[PDB]
RNA sequence: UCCUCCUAAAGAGUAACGGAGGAGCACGAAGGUUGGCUAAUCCUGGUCGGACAUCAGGAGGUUAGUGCAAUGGCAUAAGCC
RNA sequence: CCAGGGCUACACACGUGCUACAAUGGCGCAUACAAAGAGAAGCGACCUCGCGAGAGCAAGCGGACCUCAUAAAGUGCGUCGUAGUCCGGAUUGGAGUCUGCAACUCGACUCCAUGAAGUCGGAAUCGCUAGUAAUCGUGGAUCAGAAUGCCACGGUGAAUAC
């Protein structure tokens, strides 16, 4: 919807991908950067996005590269 | 007087009657018809079948009733199967673009329960 | 076949938009000048866009530019 | 009759080359095509079945038979012997000019026409499909109709299994998936 | 009649809410037909105080009553409102 | 008072405040004759249409039906036009 | 102190507003007349690009000079023919722009598509005595961005008071 020049990812997650893809599949990446986009470099890894009080594990599939990390991490619990 | 599957608007004007197709508003209909060269304020009862045939292939590039009803369903099938934020708002009948839900929320809910 | 109980069955001609004269006997008005027939319809050409439209990485690579 | 001799000079060779038949008469022949329009709302008004029977007299070329209720079931507010539907059976040559009216000028004119379903076979080799509106056929003019209903079309042949029923209709280039 | 119960430093329970509506069912039919109610409960370090604003076909009427344990406050509030409802009723009969 | 079964002991008949049910009509066609026809219920497929409406096909073989109880009948139909 | 979330949650109840339900109008084209106010990490012409929001280049201006800045309703012509309609602009999908480290939760705007309730509103209730009510546009403060609010400004302009 926005950010017409270049997708946004944080350096404390981007470099944490390239130390965790060439070294094999690793731990669920405990990250707080919901503001970052899903790049195709993380397809097939476990990511632990913070939703406010815990870290929900999300498995990055092939088709979520158009979205961001926080959209697969619901914040408010209803019923 | 048969375009893209039903299209049966008699004695309406040209750019107005074309918007009965699910897939075209007044902007595309004056863009579709200008690509075929017909004056836009003429009724379709005046149009002959030697002029309606130029309308049939021109509306075939912009997707219409048959597949446009399912491409917009392909997205909402995708989001509800993945489980994003907009998927769960689609899964529960709630507004998607972050509108107010405390008070109104009503054209998405429908009627009022109690 | 029984008399004065059926509607009239006349022999018609049907010409299409893509230029195919069809000769059927049917129950229509003056003549038939239809729109779509066994030819000039995408039921043998246009079914290739149902599943081969998605993908999210092919949308993403034109934003990458690196 | 334009496709009846088309049955006589291609598909009797085409089905025999596919199914290695020793005799000629064991190829599937098509007896009848029946057009059922189960109305159902005749219990509320008797008059709406009459214009429902006028559609079957327009799609085919002959007056339909009004079918009565067999038993008396209370789930649909009917008693037996009541007019509840109308059918028409086409045999001989009139069923052929309807069948190429169906496959050429009619089934392209249905909305959102994808490949028609192929698993809709009765288990003995008879085809059964249903259309959802009367305005597929150009005899109904979309100007004098009062309500939009549907009707069923059943094409029964002398095939013994189901894939001989698929082989016969696709030899007439029936639309499928 | 629509109740609107609200508490300032008195978080209303479920037994207290039905105690208000059963008491406000009394001063209902027995005195006047009314449109809309706003009930306000307050605790001010001694005084369990309860206010109420009734809306009727003529105008509005308000009463307040401070009490002992928030149950006698509403019991004194209804007797203050019921007398104002009979005074308003006979003001609109004049036979 | 009348009809049907059982009691009733393989002809008929056979009692009890024995066990179960019905009748006090209907019909000008629901009678006569000629001509023709064959159900119930499930299964698969099919517009709304489902556990069940109409259609097609198969299985089934009278488990249907009979103006009204029950018994005896009924396909040469006594059943359905 | 820091990150992330929340203050934006939604079976619901209420208060204040906005847009409406149309023909005293909608739309398309042509076109006439304002006041008040803001501007230096600011206002940003003209010229190019884009359907557009805007982008590039970039003068001018601490301002009766320059910029924001076309005022709109009105008027001229044409069309729609009383229909949920060429009314309504909600909702949702796709594609975009700007701001900011970052618009997922949770921004504004543009483009294409989708066209919901709504056909003048129950009991009840509100404001207004004249440049007022009712409508039309404009500007400001807050502010990176973000008003249908608020505070101001003018245009048209009533009815009625025994």
Swiss-Prot record, chain A:
PANTHER family: RIBOSOMAL PROTEIN S19P FAMILY MEMBER, SMALL RIBOSOMAL SUBUNIT PROTEIN US19M. This is Small ribosomal subunit protein uS19. Belongs to the universal ribosomal protein uS19 family. In the E.coli 70S ribosome in the initiation state it has been modeled to contact the 23S rRNA of the 50S subunit forming part of bridge B1a; this bridge is broken in the model with bound EF-G. The 23S rRNA contact site in bridge B1a is modeled to differ in different ribosomal states, contacting alternately S13 or S19. In the 3.5 angstroms resolved ribosome structures the contacts between L5, S13 and S19 bridge B1b are different, confirming the dynamic nature of this interaction. Bridge B1a is not visible in the crystallized ribosomes due to 23S rRNA disorder. InterPro entries: Ribosomal_uS19 (IPR002222), Ribosomal_uS19_bac-type (IPR005732), Ribosomal_uS19_CS (IPR020934), Ribosomal_uS19_SF (IPR023575). One of its GO terms (cellular component) is cytoplasm. GO terms for molecular function: rRNA binding; structural constituent of ribosome; tRNA binding. Part of the 30S ribosomal subunit. Binds S13 and L5 and cross-links to the A site tRNA. NCBIfam families: rpsS_bact (TIGR01050). GO terms for biological process: cytoplasmic translation; ribosomal small subunit assembly. The keyword ATP-binding does not apply. The gene is rpsS. Pfam families: Ribosomal_S19. PROSITE patterns: RIBOSOMAL_S19 (PS00323). Keywords: Ribonucleoprotein, Ribosomal protein, RNA-binding, rRNA-binding, tRNA-binding.
Swiss-Prot record, chain B:
InterPro entries: Rbsml_uS13_C, Ribosomal_uS13, Ribosomal_uS13-like_H2TH, Ribosomal_uS13_bac-type, Ribosomal_uS13_CS. Changing residue 104 to H: In PW095; partially suppresses a rimM deletion. It holds the Pfam family Ribosomal_S13. It comes from the Bacteria. GO terms for cellular component: cytoplasm; cytosol; cytosolic small ribosomal subunit; small ribosomal subunit. Keywords: Ribonucleoprotein, Ribosomal protein, RNA-binding, rRNA-binding, tRNA-binding. Residues 93-114 are annotated as: Disordered. GO terms for molecular function: rRNA binding; structural constituent of ribosome; tRNA binding. The keyword DNA-binding does not apply. GO terms for biological process: cytoplasmic translation. PROSITE patterns: RIBOSOMAL_S13_1, RIBOSOMAL_S13_2. Part of the 30S ribosomal subunit. Forms a loose heterodimer with protein S19. Cross-links to the P site tRNA and weakly to the A site tRNA. Forms two bridges to the 50S subunit in the 70S ribosome, contacting the 16S rRNA and proteins S19 and L5. Belongs to the universal ribosomal protein uS13 family. NCBIfam families: uS13_bact. This is Small ribosomal subunit protein uS13. It comes from Escherichia coli (strain K12).
UniProtKB/Swiss-Prot annotation, chain C:
Its cofactor is Zn(2+). The lineage of its organism: Bacteria, Pseudomonadati, Pseudomonadota, Gammaproteobacteria, Enterobacterales. The modification N6-acetyllysine is found at residue 8. Belongs to the bacterial ribosomal protein bL31 family. Type A subfamily. This is Large ribosomal subunit protein bL31. Binds the 23S rRNA. The keyword Transmembrane does not apply. One of its GO terms (molecular function) is structural constituent of ribosome. Proteolytically cleaved by protease VII to yield a peptide lacking residues 63-70. It is not clear if this is due to protein degradation or is a bona fide processing event in the strain used in PubMed:339950 and PubMed:10556732. In strains B, D10, MRE-600 and Q13 the only protein seen in PubMed:10556732 was full-length; the last 7 amino acids were sequenced only for strain MRE-600.
UniProtKB/Swiss-Prot annotation, chain D:
Gene3D superfamilies: 3.30.1440.10. The gene is rplE. Identified as a multicopy suppressor of the slow growth phenotype of an rsgA (yjeQ) deletion mutant. It comes from Escherichia coli (strain K12). Part of the 50S ribosomal subunit; part of the 5S rRNA/L5/L18/L25 subcomplex. Contacts the 5S rRNA; cross-links to the P site tRNA. Forms a bridge to the 30S subunit in the 70S ribosome, contacting protein S13 and S19. Belongs to the universal ribosomal protein uL5 family. One of its GO terms (molecular function) is structural constituent of ribosome. GO terms for cellular component: cytoplasm; cytosol; cytosolic large ribosomal subunit. The modification N6-acetyllysine is found at residue 2. Pfam families: Ribosomal_L5 (PF00281), Ribosomal_L5_C (PF00673). This is one of the proteins that bind and probably mediate the attachment of the 5S RNA into the large ribosomal subunit, where it forms part of the central protuberance. Its 5S rRNA binding is significantly enhanced in the presence of L18. In the 70S ribosome in the initiation state was modeled to contact protein S13 of the 30S subunit (bridge B1b), connecting the 2 subunits; the protein-protein contacts between S13 and L5 in B1b change in the model with bound EF-G implicating this bridge in subunit movement. In the two 3.5 A resolved ribosome structures the contacts between L5, S13 and S19 are different, confirming the dynamic nature of this interaction.
């Amino acid at each position: 919807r926005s950010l017409k020049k270049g997708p946004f990812i944080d350096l404390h997650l981007l470099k944490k991908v390239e130390k965790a893809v060439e070294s094999g599949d690793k731990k669920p990446l405990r990250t707080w950067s919901r503001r970052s986009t899903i790049f195709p470099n993380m397809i097939g890894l476990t990511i632990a996005v913070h939703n406010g009080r815990q870290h929900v594990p999300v498995f990055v599939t092939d088709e979520m590269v158009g979205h961001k990390l926080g959209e697969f991490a619901p914040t408010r619990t209803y019923r | 007087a048969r375009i893209a599957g039903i299209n049966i608007p008699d004695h309406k004007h040209a750019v107005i009657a074309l918007t009965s197709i699910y897939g075209v508003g007044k902007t595309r209909s004056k863009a579709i018809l200008a690509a075929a060269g017909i004056a836009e304020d003429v009724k379709i009862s005046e149009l002959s079948e030697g002029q309606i045939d130029t309308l049939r292939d021109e509306v075939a590039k912009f997707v219409v009733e048959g597949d446009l009803r399912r491409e917009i369903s392909m997205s909402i099938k995708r989001l509800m199967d993945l489980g994003c934020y907009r998927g769960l708002r689609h899964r529960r009948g709630l507004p998607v673009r972050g509108q107010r839900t405390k008070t109104n929320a009503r054209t998405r809910k429908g009627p009022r329960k109690p | 076949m029984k008399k004065d109980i059926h509607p009239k069955y006349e022999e018609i001609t049907a010409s299409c938009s893509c230029g195919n004269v069809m000769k059927i006997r049917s129950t229509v008005g003056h003549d038939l000048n239809l729109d779509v027939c066994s030819k000039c319809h995408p039921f043998f050409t246009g079914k290739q866009r149902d599943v081969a439209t998605g993908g999210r990485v092919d949308r993403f690579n034109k934003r990458f530019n690196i | 009759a334009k496709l009846h001799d088309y049955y006589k000079d291609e598909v009797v060779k085409k089905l025999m080359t596919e199914f290695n038949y020793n005799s000629v008469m064991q190829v599937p022949r098509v007896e009848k095509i029946t057009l059922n329009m189960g109305v159902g709302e005749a219990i509320a008004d008797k008059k709406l079945l009459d214009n429902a029977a006028a559609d079957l007299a327009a799609i085919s070329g002959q007056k339909p038979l009004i079918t009565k209720a067999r038993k008396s079931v209370a789930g649909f507010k009917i008693r037996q012997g009541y007019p509840i539907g109308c059918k028409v059976t086409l045999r001989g040559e009139r069923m052929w000019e309807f069948f190429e009216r169906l496959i050429t000028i009619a089934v392209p004119r249905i909305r959102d026409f994808r490949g028609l379903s192929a698993k809709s076979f009765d288990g003995r080799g008879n085809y059964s499909m249903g259309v959802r509106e009367q305005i597929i056929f150009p005899e109904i003019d979309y100007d004098k109709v009062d309500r939009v209903r549907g009707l069923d079309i059943t094409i029964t042949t002398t095939a013994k299994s189901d894939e001989e029923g698929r082989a016969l209709l696709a030899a007439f280039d029936f639309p499928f998936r | 009649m629509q109740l609107n119960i609200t508490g300032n430093n008195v978080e209303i329970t479920e037994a207290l809410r039905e105690f208000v509506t059963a008491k406000f069912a009394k001063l209902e039919q027995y005195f006047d037909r009314i449109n809309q109610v706003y009930v306000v409960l307050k605790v001010e370090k001694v005084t369990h105080t309860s206010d109420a604003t009734l809306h009727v076909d003529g105008g509005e009427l308000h009463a307040s009553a401070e009490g002992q344990d928030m149950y006698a406050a509403i019991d004194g509030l209804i007797d203050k409102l019921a007398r104002q409802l009979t005074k308003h009723k006979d003001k609109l009969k004049q036979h």
